[PDB]
Each structure stands twice: as C-alpha cells, then as structure tokens.
Amino acid sequence: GSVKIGHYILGDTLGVGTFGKVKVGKHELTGHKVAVKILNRQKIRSLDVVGKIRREIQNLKLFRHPHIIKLYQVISTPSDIFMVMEYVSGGELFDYICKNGRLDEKESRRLFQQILSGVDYCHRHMVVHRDLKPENVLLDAHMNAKIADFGLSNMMSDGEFLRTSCGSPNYAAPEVISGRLYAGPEVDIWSSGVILYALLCGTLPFDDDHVPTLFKKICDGIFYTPQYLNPSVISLLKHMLQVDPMKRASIKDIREHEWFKQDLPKYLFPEIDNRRIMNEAKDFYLATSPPDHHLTRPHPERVPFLVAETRKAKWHLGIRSQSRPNDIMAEVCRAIKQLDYEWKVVNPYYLRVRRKNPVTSTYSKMSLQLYQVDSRTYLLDFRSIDDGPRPGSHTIEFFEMCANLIKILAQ
Amino acid sequence: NNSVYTSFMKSHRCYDLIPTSSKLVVFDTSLQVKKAFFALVTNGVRAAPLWDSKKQSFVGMLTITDFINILHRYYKSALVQIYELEEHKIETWREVYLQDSFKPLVCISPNASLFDAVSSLIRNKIHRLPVIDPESGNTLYILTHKRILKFLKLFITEFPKPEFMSKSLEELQIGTYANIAMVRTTTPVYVALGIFVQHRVSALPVVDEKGRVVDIYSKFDVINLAAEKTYNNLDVSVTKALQHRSHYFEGVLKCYLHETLETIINRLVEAEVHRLVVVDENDVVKGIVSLSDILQALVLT
Amino acid sequence: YAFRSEERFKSPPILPPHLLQVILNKDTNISCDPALLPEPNHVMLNHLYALSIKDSVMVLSATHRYKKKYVTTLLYKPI
Ligand SMILES: Nc1ncnc2c1ncn2[C@@H]1O[C@H](COP(=O)(O)O)[C@@H](O)[C@H]1O
Ligand SMILES: Nc1ncnc2c1ncn2[C@@H]1O[C@H](COP(=O)(O)O)[C@@H](O)[C@H]1O
Ligand SMILES: Nc1ncnc2c1ncn2[C@@H]1O[C@H](COP(=O)(O)O)[C@@H](O)[C@H]1O
C-alpha cells in the first residue's frame, strides 16, 4: 500500500529539517500540494522536552501571515506526529542567492521588507524565531518570501528572558554566541541583519573556517563592506548588527530608516486621516521621547513642576558586595525568619518564594534571581507572578512582601 | 438630544479610557502628610490612592484639595510656625477630616460603561475616580473630567452630529452665572484657600479693580507652593504666587456667551484645562463653565 | 555552513542589559500628560524597581501589565 494522512498521500521528501524530515502531501481527490513535517515519536521521546513541543505547535497554529508558513492542521498518532503546512516551490533563499549570485537593491529591498514583517508578526505575538537563515526561508511560485522552520523558536514570557543558545554559528547574535540572557527580539534583528547582508554581497558578513574565531569575529562589530551599495544600507546594517544589544536597532528603527522606506507597500505593516490618527496614538495614549526643537505647549499640570525646575535617583533592586553562595545563605535565614517559605527551583541563586496574606486568605508569590553585575558585586532581582471580588491588591501585596524582606536584609 | 452622546457612553467601558502605559503613585496611611505632598509634585500626579497596611485595602483618595484644606485649617502666620503639618500623618489627618463627615472611597470597575463613570463623577461630585480591576484588586488609572472630554470629542464620529451642539452657550443655560467665587490680584493666597474650602469650586479667577480677568488661580495651582517649598508663607498675593509661571503661560482661556457650544468644547479639550471664564468686551466676569457642567449637560441634557 | 553549536553554563547568570533600563528615570515629552509613560519592554514588566531610600520611607515600584495596558505602580511606605 502507501502511507497517507487523512486525504493527503505522502511522497517525495523535501528535506531533513530541525527534528523530523519533511515530505510533500497530495490530496487524494483534488491533488493539492502541502508540506508535512514528520516527527517520529521514538526520535522525540529520546530527547526530553515536554513543554517545548507543546508551545511550539500552539504558536504556529494561530499564525496567519503571507510570509509565515501557515500551519493548516496537526494530525497525531502513537507512531509519529505530523504537521501539514503550505507548500511553496523555489526552495530556500540560500538556493536563490547562490544561483542568482548577488541580489541588487530593487530586489533585496523587496525581500528584506517581507521577511522583516514576518518576524515583526512573530515578535508582536510574543514569539521569537531564533534560527533565521536564508536556508530557512522559502520562496513561492511568485518568488516571494516564506519563513519556514519554527523548531528552534520559543515563546516569550512577561518578565522572562531566554537562556538557551542553539543553531549554526553565523547568524547567532553576539550575545547568544556568548551564552548570555536575551529578550529575543534583538537576536532576530541581528539574525535578520546578516540575512540582509547575504541578500546583497552573497557572502556572509561573519564567516570563518573554525570557531571560536568565528565568534571572536562576531563579538567584534567589524565586518567587510563592499563598494557594492550606497551608504544607507550600511548605516542600517551597522546599526542593526551593533555588538551592543542596547545600541542595536529595534523593529521600529528599521521601519523608520530611509532605505527601508523606499518602494515599501502598506499591506506589509498593518497601519488627513494620518494626522487625525496621530491623536489616536498621540500624546494622549503614550509618551514621546524628548524632541533644538520648536517650543511646544506643555500640559498645564506638567508646567508647574517644570517651570520651577529648569534628584531623581531610582535604583534597580537590593544590591550588595558579598559572595554568591555566602549571600543567599544570609538571605534565606531572613526569608525563613518570617512566616514566608521558600522553594528554590533549578538554580541555587534562583529562589521562588510565596506567602499567605496576613489579613485575608489570598496568596501572592514572586521570583528572586541573583545575577552578577561585575567582578566585585552581585545583584538580587525581585519579580512578580501570575495565576489562573477581593478586598486586597495583588500589586501592592507584592511590594509589601518584598519591602518586609528587604527591611531585614539592610538594617 | 440624548440619542447619541448618551448611548455612546453606555457602549464603551472605562477600559478604552486608560492610557496604553501610565504611572500612578499610592501612599500608605501610615505615611506622613508632609512627605506625601512633596511626592506629588516630584511624580507629576495630583492624586494618589490611599493604601491601608492593616486593612490591606484602599481607604480613600489624596488630592491637592487635601493640601488646601490642611493649609487653611492649621495656620498661624507665614513667619511664626512650621509646626502642625510636619509631624501630622496621612491617617491622623483623615481622622480630623472625617471627624465632621464620613465618606468612604469611591471606585469603578474598568469593565463598567463610561456612563457609569460620568455618573459617579456628577453624583459623588468628585474629580478623581480610580479604576480598579475587581479581579486583581489593583488600581490602574485615575479617571479625570479632562480625560473623558478629550476621549469624547476625539473618539466620537462625524455622522449623528448635525443637531444640538450648534446652539449657542447663552441660550443653552449651561454653567453657573449666579455667584462667581473669585479673588482679587492683591488678595492673600490664604483667603484664596479659605474660599476653596468654603465653596467646592476648583478655581478662582483673579480680577483687578475693574473686575476683569487678568489671571486664574486653580485648585491645582496651589500645589506649586509645595513644589517650591514656599507654602510656609501664605500671606503673599495670588498674583505673587502665580508669578512663577507668569513667564510661560499665554493668557487666560475664556469664551463668550454668544459662542456655540461646539466651539467651546473644542477649545477646551485642546487647551487641556478644566474650565473657561465667559466674559464680554470689557473682559469682566460673567460666569464659569467647567468640565463638570459639560459632563452634566450630557448625561441627561 | 553547519552545524549547531554550544551553550554557556557558568553561574550565577550575568545581569541582562534590558533590566538596567528603567522607564521611571526616562524623560517623556514636555506636552504629554505627566501620568503617561512609553510602552515598556515585556521583559522588564514584572520586575521590581526600588528607589534609593534617602527618606525614612521605603519607596519601591514595578510596572505591571493589564490585558492590553501597562501600569507603573509606585508605593510610598514608611519603614
Ligand atoms: N474617590 C475619592 N475617595 C475618597 N475621597 C475622595 C475621593 N474623591 C475626592 N475625595 C475627597 O475630596 C477631596 C478631593 O476633591 P477633588 O479635588 O474635587 O477630587 C479630598 O479632600 C478627598 O479626601
Ligand atoms: N469659580 C467658580 N465660582 C462659582 N462656581 C463655580 C466656579 N467654578 C466652578 N463652579 C461651578 O462648580 C462646578 C464645577 O466645579 P469643578 O469641577 O470643581 O471646577 C460647576 O457646576 C460650576 O458651575
Ligand atoms: N480657564 C483657564 N485659563 C487659563 N489657565 C487655566 C484655566 N484653567 C486651568 N488653567 C491652568 O491649568 C491648571 C489647572 O488645571 P485644572 O486642575 O485642570 O483646572 C493651572 O496651572 C492653571 O493655570
């Protein structure tokens, strides 16, 4: 016989993929073409992630984007898990670049815009596609852009960062190659930068035959710039590929850039009605950074403080100079000094404490992680929680809970 | 006349009113009043929700009005005493404030309609209505008469518009012309607070010998005394107190009786003030139209 | 150019740069409502920000998020 999932019969294999190999489906009746990713249960049972796979399928499910490979349905069985996806011909962009040599402006601009909207879509949905390669992005019949493999992707959490580092050497951000904590939008921006570079020079901006010298090249923001293009794409790339994650460009920064604006359709970014729209998103909803500039009318309630001004020194959290293990121990004694109890998770410097409300039956938790600021000093972080009528406040209870703990740690 | 503005408020929750990202400070009832008021000018906010550590709940609100009351209440002379205020504490002052009258904190769920909010503002006669999520119990944003008017004109559409607003102010009889609480330019800032405590008015337009409006002293203007730490001297003129911003403001926002209601609301949400003083050719006082008047001219009409 | 590379296990983890950027020390425009702040990064949201206590009152704050909104709640509590 022949293997088939639902009305889709399997067939010729497309590739190896991240986990399982992918093959082409064909509708028994109509004959439509889809791409199914075959992940063998036996192969995914060996490695142990019981939440990573759950959230993966969860995220790609809701996603609908022209440049994001759209997950249709997921068919399951004790043998292996399947995912049917939109099939497109023209292979990976890596095959397109190499075969076509070096793309020009009028072209690269088109494609880069497309890909950047897909990742913007992802980031807006609180997910980060960590491994972004021209080898991971396909092209349809019309030679558009399609982001493909979400395997290495992860879902972003509030107040949470991402430890793990994975993937090939070249597209990995200067921070993830150094195995440091990241938010995840920036690691895509850097990964998108090196993609924009390959779409121009045909060669990777950071490439070496052996590591870490590739990482050493990546950590250093120096990279070859061909006479090939104008200085605008360079100002973009250098600000995008910046070694400092704080000095890097955000998804907003690229949108505002000049070279990125030219010949860019409206559909990609979901945005007299232009001035009227200002007010809808203007000073009313959010605060604008200081605009050297024309004098503007300050809000009446903001002037009296201001007219009399022209200090404010607010810190991070409790920060001492003691040793890593010698610190937490001097802390936990105070954590147990009160009624509050502590169950510490994986890291010895990471603790999760929670206590019952003294007035009511409510209970608020939190998270304390000990970081290292430099050679001579360490820092303790305080983070709130979540769970899923009341005479008390979850936000305030968090403060009082911390304040009481901090009181004993200081005086 | 209620076909549109009245329905609109019932069809939109206070949620849409809340800024994307805002800032709010809350004081403990155990905190000293002196430190509290200074915190108000440093953070920019004119209102803070009062939190009780023992009751573990929100007992009430703290506005500039409080600073006005306690200033007029305990005062001896500009030069003789910095005494009463310093030691006094938030809960201790609430005790002598509630000694006369008992009025618990009012609040509205962010899921409640905008019509419920505008009701709680007129019914309770209050400018600060905190929105608190009943599920979490956390105060989100402090609703304001200004915040609503802005939201109203900005969000409301073009279509149902053509009829009632066009009618002029003089003919609509909106706002109080009967007794106007005002201060001279030479009147001490103390007696200004004395009028602020007697009448629940939120501002006192200043006048010269001719009765013309050369400036305005708002309940918010007095917080500057705490900002500049000049609150010790209450013997100064309101003109002397408003002399700090005198090099900044354009003039006194106002309107005319024969002007359309429409033209008034626009100029009002754009200037982002709480009221306008209607006048004549001589710029002499006629009456006062505040946001409370406009809001009360909507809910029923 | 394959394959997939390594990770760093040296502990304690180094303090991420994002957290050191506080929205309360940033300065907004001059014309906006004073109670307004820019849209905060989702990573720094649940974290607590304590102000140096130069006063006998401990003042600490954090930026908590609503369903679509964000709020920075500052609390002044004496020692
Ligand atoms: N929502 C409220 N809860 C408790 N007290 C309030 C509230 N609103 C106003 N007040 C009191 O009224 C004064 C503020 O008035 P106003 O400036 O008009 O909002 C202060 O003295 C407060 O104690
Ligand atoms: N300076 C004033 N003198 C007399 N009445 C006033 C004055 N300002 C406002 N009002 C009235 O008080 C209400 C507005 O109060 P408020 O929202 O606190 O400014 C309206 O009904 C006005 O008619
Ligand atoms: N009708 C007005 N004309 C001129 N300035 C005003 C007027 N109303 C309010 N202000 C200013 O705005 C502040 C008071 O705002 P509010 O608490 O909303 O009435 C003060 O700094 C006043 O100087």
Instruction: Give me the CATH number covering residue B72.
Output: 3.10.580.10
CB-based contact, B226 to chain A, within 8 Å:
no
Q: How far is ligand 1, taken at its centre, from the CA of residue B154, in Å?
A: 27
Residue C63 belongs to a domain: yes
Domain boundary among B125, B154, B183: B154
Q: Same structural domain for residues B131 and B184?
A: no
Chain Cα centroid distance, residue A14: 27
List all residues 6 or more positions away from B99 whose beta carbon is below 8 Å from its beta carbon: none
The rounded distance, in Å, linking the Cα atoms of A109 and A113 is 6
Q: Which of A201, A202, A132, A137 is nearest to A170 (CA)?
A: A132
Pairing of strands A363-365, A350-356: antiparallel
Q: Which of these, A120, A113, A98, A128, lies nearest to A198 by C-alpha position?
A: A98
Give the phi and the psi of residue A365 in degrees, each rounded to 5: -105, -175
The Cβ of residue B8 has, within 10 Å, a number of other Cβ atoms equal to: 18
Distance of residue C56 Cα from the nearest chain A Cα, in angstroms: 12
Burial level of A402, CB count in 10 A (0-12/13-18/19+)?
buried
The structure tokens listed for A373 are 């600021």
Query: Residue A193 in contact with residue A115, Cβ under 8 Å?
Result: no
Instruction: Give domain status of residue C2, yes or no.
Output: no
**Burial (CB count within 10 angstroms: exposed 0-12, middle 13-18, buried 19+), residue A213:** exposed
| B30 neighbourhood in chain C, CB within 8 Å | 77-78
Please give the radius of gyration of chain A, using alpha carbons only, rounded to the nearest integer.
Answer: 26
By DSSP bridging, strand A33-40 and strand A146-147 are: unpaired
Q: How many CB atoms lie within 10 A of CB A116?
A: 24
Q: Tokens 């003089």 identify what position?
A: B170
Q: Is B160 part of a structural domain of the chain? A: no
The answer for residues whose C-beta is within 8 angstroms of residue A284's C-beta and 6 or more apart is B19, B150, B154, C33
Measured distance CA(C72)–CA(C63) in Å, rounded: 4
Of A139, A99, A91, A95, nearest to A115 (Cα)? A139
Q: Which residue has the tokens 């809910």?
A: B299
Residue from A334, A368, A364 nearest A348 by CA: A368
| Residue B290 one-letter amino acid | S
Burial pattern A56-72, b for ≥16 Cβ within 10 A else e, equals: beebbeebebbbbbebe
Is the CB of residue A267 less than 8 Å away from at least one CB of chain B? no
Q: How far apart are CA C40 and CA A53, in angstroms?
A: 29
Which chain A residues contact residue B272 at CB under 8 A? 299-300
Spell out which residues line ligand 1, taking CB within 6 angstroms.
Answer: B 60-61, 63, 65-66, 105-106, 126-129, 219
Q: What's the CA gap between B168 and B257, in Å, rounded?
A: 7
Query: Where among B90, B124, B154 does a domain terminate?
Result: B154
For residue B37, give the 3-state DSSP assignment: helix
Ligand 2: atom nearest CA of B275 is: 19
Are the CB atoms for A137 and A146 separated by under 8 Å? yes
Residues B115 and B182 in one domain: no
- Identify the CATH assignment for A93-261 out of 1.10.150.120, 1.10.1760.20, 2.60.40.10, 1.10.510.10: 1.10.510.10
Structure tokens at B225: 């005394």
Same domain, yes or no: B236 and B116:
no
Task: Say how far apart CA B57 and CA A242 lie, in whole Å.
Answer: 48
Torsions phi, psi for B32 (to 5 deg): -70, 145
Pick the CATH number of A319-410 from 3.30.310.80, 3.30.300.180, 3.30.230.10, 3.30.60.50: 3.30.310.80
Choose among A304, A392, A396: nearest Cβ to B223. Answer: A304
Report the interhelical angle of A324-335 vs A394-410 (nearest 10°): 120
C-alpha distances in angstroms, B22 versus A157, A285, A288, C75? 21, 9, 13, 15
**Architecture of domain A4-86 in this structure:** 2-Layer Sandwich (3.30)
Whether residue B255 is contained in a domain is answered as: yes
A410: closest chain C residue by CA: C53
8 Å CB contact of B134 and A390:
yes
Whole-number Å distance, alpha carbon B128 to ligand 3 midpoint, is: 16
Tokens of A117: 């909207």
How many Å apart are CA A133 and CA A94, to the nearest integer?
Answer: 8
Is B232 in the same domain as B182?
yes
A240 burial (CB, 10 Å; 0-12 / 13-18 / 19+) is: buried
Q: Which ligand is nearest to the CA of B178?
A: 2
Total domain count, chain B = 2
Interacting residues of B227 by C-beta distance below 8 A, sequence separation 6+ = A304, A305, A308, B41
Work out how many domains chain C is built from and give that number.
Answer: 1
Atom number of ligand 3 nearest to Cα B215: 4
> C53-67 as b/e, with b when 16 or more CB fall inside 10 Å?
eebebbbbbbbbbbe
Neighbours of chain C (3+ CB pairs under 8 A): A, B
SS3 content of chain B, % helix, strand, coil (to 5): 35, 20, 40
CA nearest to A250 within chain C: C41
Asked if residue C1 belongs to a domain, the reply is: no
User: CB C42 to CB A158 under 8 A?
Assistant: yes
User: Which residues of chain C neighbour B19 with C-beta distances below 8 Å?
Assistant: 33, 35-36, 69
The answer to whether residue C22 is domain-embedded is yes
User: Residue by residue, what is the 3-state secondary structure of chain A?
Assistant: CCCEECCEECCCEEECCCCCCEEEEEECCCCCEEEEEEEEHHHHHHCCCCCHHHHHHHHHHHCCECCECCEEECCCCCCEEEEEEECCCCCEHHHHHHHHCCCCHHHHHHHHHHHHHHHHHHHHCCEECCCCCCCCEECCCCCCCEECCCCCCEECCCCCCECCCCCCCCCCCCCCCCCCCECCHHHHHHHHHHHHHHHHHCCCCCCCCCCCHHHHHHHCCCCCCCCCCCHHHHHHHHHHCCCCCCCCCCHHHHHHCHHHHCCCCCCCCCCCHHHHHHHHHCCCCCCCCCCCCCCCCCCCCCHHHHHCCCCCCECCCCEECCCHHHHHHHHHHHHCCCCCEEECCCCCCEEEEEEECCCCCCEEECEEEEEECCCCCEEEEEECCCCCCCCCCHHHHHHHHHHHHHHHHHC
Tokens of B137: 């119990």
DSSP three-state, residue C47: strand
CA distance A330 to A318: 14
- The CA distance from A188 to A120, in Å, is 10
Q: For chain B, first and last CA: distance in Å?
A: 7
Using a CB-CB distance cutoff of 8 angstroms, which residues of chain B are in contact with residue C24? Answer: 23
Supply the DSSP symbol for B54.
T
CA distance A364 to A354: 6
Beta carbons of A130 and A186 less than 8 angstroms apart:
no
What gap in Å lies between CA A64 and CA A119, rounded to an integer? 12
- Could you say which of A12, A95, A120, A131 is catalytic? A131
Count the Cβ atoms, other than its own, within 10 Å of residue C68. 9
Contact A38, A47 (CB under 8 A): no
Contacts of A363 (CB under 8 A, 6+ apart): A354, A355, A356, A357
- Of B213, B273, B278, the residue with max ligand 3 atoms within 8 A of its CB, to mutate for a pocket test, comes to B273
Count the residues in chain B. Answer: 301
The beta-carbon neighbor of A371 closest among C13, C51, C61 is: C13
Dihedral sign, Cα of residue A45, residue A47, residue A50, residue A53: negative
Which phi and psi angles does A242 have, rounded to 5°? -50, 135
At B77, which amino acid appears? S
**Neighbouring residues of A108: CB distance < 8 A, sequence distance ≥ 6:** A196, A199, A200
| Ligand 2 centroid from CA B33, angstroms | 27
Q: What is the DSSP string of B186-242?
A: SSBHHHHHHHHHHS--SEEEEE-TT-BEEEEEETTGGGHHHHTT-TT---SBHHHHG
User: Of B201, B40, B23, nearest to B125 (Cα)?
Assistant: B201
Answer whether B131's CB lies under 8 Å from B14's CB: yes
Residue from B225, B274, B285, B286 whose mutation best tests the ligand 3 pocket (most atoms within 8 A of CB): B274
Q: In the structure encoding, which two tokens stand for residue A48, read together?
A: 């142990």
- Whether A345 and chain C come into contact, CB under 8 Å, resolves to no
Q: Find where tokens 């649940």 sit.
A: C46
- Kindly report each contact of residues A340-344 with a partner whose C-beta sits within 8 Å and lies 24 or more positions away, as own/partner: A340/A401, A340/A405
Residue A131 annotated among the catalytic residues of the structure? yes
Q: Measure CA of the first residue to CA of the last residue in chain C; give whole Å.
A: 59
Domains of chain A, residue spans: 4-86, 93-261, 274-307, 319-410
A313 contacts C51 by C-beta, under 8 angstroms = yes
Q: Which helix (H) or strand (E) holds B49?
A: strand B47-52
| Helices vs. strands in chain B: H and E counts, helices first | 13, 11
* φ/ψ of residue A298, rounded to 5: -75, 140
B185/B254 same-domain check: yes
Q: How far is A71 from A37, CA to CA, in rounded Å? A: 10
Residue B100 sits in the same domain as residue B235: no
Ligand 3 centroid to Cα of residue B225, in Å, is 16
Interface contact C74, partner B, CB < 8 A? yes
Domain span holding position C72: 17-78
Please tell me the total number of residues recorded for chain C in this structure: 79
How do beta strands A367-372 and A378-383 pair? antiparallel
- CATH number of the domain that C71 lies in? 2.20.25.290
* Resolution of the model in angstroms: 4.6
Give the residue among A50, A68, A217, A214 at the shortest CA–CA distance from A137: A68
Instruction: Please tell me the residue having the least CA distance from ligand 2 atom 18.
Output: B202
Kindly report the backbone phi and psi dihedral angles of residue B39, in degrees, each rounded to the nearest multiple of 5, phi listed first.
-70, -25
Residue A193 assigned to a binding site: no
Could you tell me if residue C61 is inside a domain? Answer: yes
Looking at CA atoms only, how far is residue C20 from chain B in angstroms? 19
Burial (CB count <10 Å: 0-12, 13-18, 19+), residue B210: exposed
A177 contacts on C by Cβ (under 8 Å): 5
B51 shares contact with chain A (CB less than 8 Å): yes
Cα separation, A146 vs A88, in Å, equals: 8
Name the structure determination technique. X-ray
Please report all neighbours of B, defined by 3+ CB atom pairs within 8 A.
A, C
Query: What is the rounded distance in angstroms from the CA atom of residue A268 to the CA atom of residue B298?
Result: 42
Structure tokens at A79: 């043998």
Instruction: Provide the shortest C-alpha distance from residue A41 to chain C (in Å).
Output: 22
Angle of the B33-43 helix axis to the B90-97 helix axis, nearest 10: 100
Distance B129 CA to ligand 3 centre (A): 20
Residue B289 lies in a domain: yes
- Residue A132 to chain B, least CA–CA distance (Å): 31
Domain of B209 in residue numbering reads as: 169-296
Residue C43 lies in a domain: yes
Comparing CA positions, the residue from B69, B72, B173, B61 lying closest to residue B121 is: B61
DSSP code for B59: E
Find out whether B216 and B252 touch, Cβ atoms under 8 Å: yes
Nearest CA to B248 out of B277, B221, B287, B229 is that of B221
Out of B154, B180, B212, a domain closes at B154
For residues B51 and B133, state if they share a domain: yes
Are B37 and B224 contacting, i.e. CB atoms less than 8 angstroms apart?
A: no
Mark whether B72 and B182 lie in a shared domain.
no
Short-list A231, A236, A261, CA closest to A248: A236
Q: A382 to each of A33, A366, B140, C54, how far by Cα in Å?
A: 51, 7, 21, 20
Q: Which residue of A has its CA nearest to B25?
A: A396
Residues in chain A: 411
CA distance C33 to A284: 7
Tokens at residue A168, please? 């090939």
Chain A residues with beta carbon closer than 8 angstroms to that of C37: 286-287
Is the CB of B287 within 6 Å of ligand 2?
no
